[PDB]
């Protein structure tokens, strides 16, 4: 069977370049292979270029991307990558059609600053973005600063997981590591949440050192030895 990855929200939102990719797996390496994408309506579809390499373990791999308009995918029309092999004359159909129906549960985004019990150690400041409450289970968190998204490699995130309360909810996590000094010097490091139920499909929160209630000082110096204990 030839694998075909349906366009995920993390792919149609990262580069704004939604494309269809089907990868041949669990097959044998042979030439004279025709890989393309077919349309139910029958309209012409550009053949994806950039053929993959050959697996040294005697496995065939063919990859490609075709540029489409995201409205067609959002409408619900199917996508099929038809792969024909010499050893397998029967064509393989990969129905890549988005499921219909969207859950009604906008996500709530909360932030938490690094603990001072780690700041005094002066090793690293870990900031967490607690994406919570999104349904259906699809979210694409990204950390950005200085007006550009920080290389995602610097941060890590977790997959959606259930709750022990209410029918239909999901939660997430994210950790960004930055030396305490850089965190103390400045840097906001805002967090963003990309869920398909938001008013503009994008929502973001931000924290820093001075994100808390201002603290006043009630200094009460006393120089009279008679006064005081």
């Amino acid at each position: 069977r030839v694998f075909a990855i349906p366009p995920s929200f993390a792919s149609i939102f990262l580069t704004k370049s939604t494309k269809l990719t089907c990868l041949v797996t669990d097959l044998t390496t042979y030439d004279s292979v025709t890989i393309s994408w077919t349309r139910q309506n029958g309209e012409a579809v550009k053949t994806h270029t950039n053929i993959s390499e050959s697996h040294p373990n005697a496995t065939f791999s063919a990859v490609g991307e075709a540029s489409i308009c995201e409205d067609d995918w959002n409408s619900g029309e199917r996508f099929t990558c038809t792969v024909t092999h010499t050893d397998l004359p029967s064509p393989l159909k990969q129905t890549i059609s988005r499921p219909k129906g969207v859950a009604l549960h906008r996500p709530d985004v909360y932030l938490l600053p690094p603990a001072r019990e780690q700041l005094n150690l002066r090793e690293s400041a870990t900031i967490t973005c607690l994406v919570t409450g999104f349904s259906p289970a699809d979210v694409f968190v990204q950390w950005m600063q200085r007006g550009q998204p920080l290389s995602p490699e610097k941060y890590v995130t977790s997959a959606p997981m259930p709750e022990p309360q209410a029918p239909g909810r999901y939660f997430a996590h994210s950790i960004l590591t930055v030396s305490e000094e850089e965190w103390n010097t400045g840097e906001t490091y805002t967090c963003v949440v990309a869920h398909e139920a938001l008013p503009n499909r994008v929502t973001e929160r931000t924290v820093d050192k001075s994100t808390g209630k201002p603290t006043l000082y009630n200094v009460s110096l006393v120089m009279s030895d008679t006064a005081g204990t």
Binding site: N120, L121, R122, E123, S124, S179, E180, E181, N184
Partner: protein
């Protein structure tokens, strides 16, 4: 309290001698920034080598003479200040020994 006042030359390498205490696991060679009263950890046993010193420093501990030795390879003008070494989770509370560094070129 004690100062090695270690000296060296531009390029090459220089070894910093600091005491290795017991009942203290985290051992660090903090650099006294002395800017806003803050010291930044250059190296630690928890595995954190500052970016400016990445791939140029190492920390080897061996309780033979109760000493841990830290070597700094290469040298730059920037490498000419105070590197207080100490232990404990808190960094600006340890600094058991103070040392100074310079460049001869």
């Amino acid at each position: 309290l004690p100062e090695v006042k270690v000296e060296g030359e531009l390029g090459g390498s220089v070894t910093i001698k600091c005491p290795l205490p017991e009942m203290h696991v985290r051992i660090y060679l903090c650099r006294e920034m002395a800017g806003s009263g803050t010291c930044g950890t250059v190296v630690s046993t928890t595995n954190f080598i500052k970016a400016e010193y990445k791939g140029r420093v190492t920390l080897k501990q061996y309780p033979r003479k109760n000493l841990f030795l830290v070597e700094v390879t290469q040298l730059t003008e920037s490498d000419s200040g105070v590197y207080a070494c100490g232990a404990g989770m808190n960094t600006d509370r340890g600094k058991t020994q103070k040392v100074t560094l310079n460049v001869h070129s």
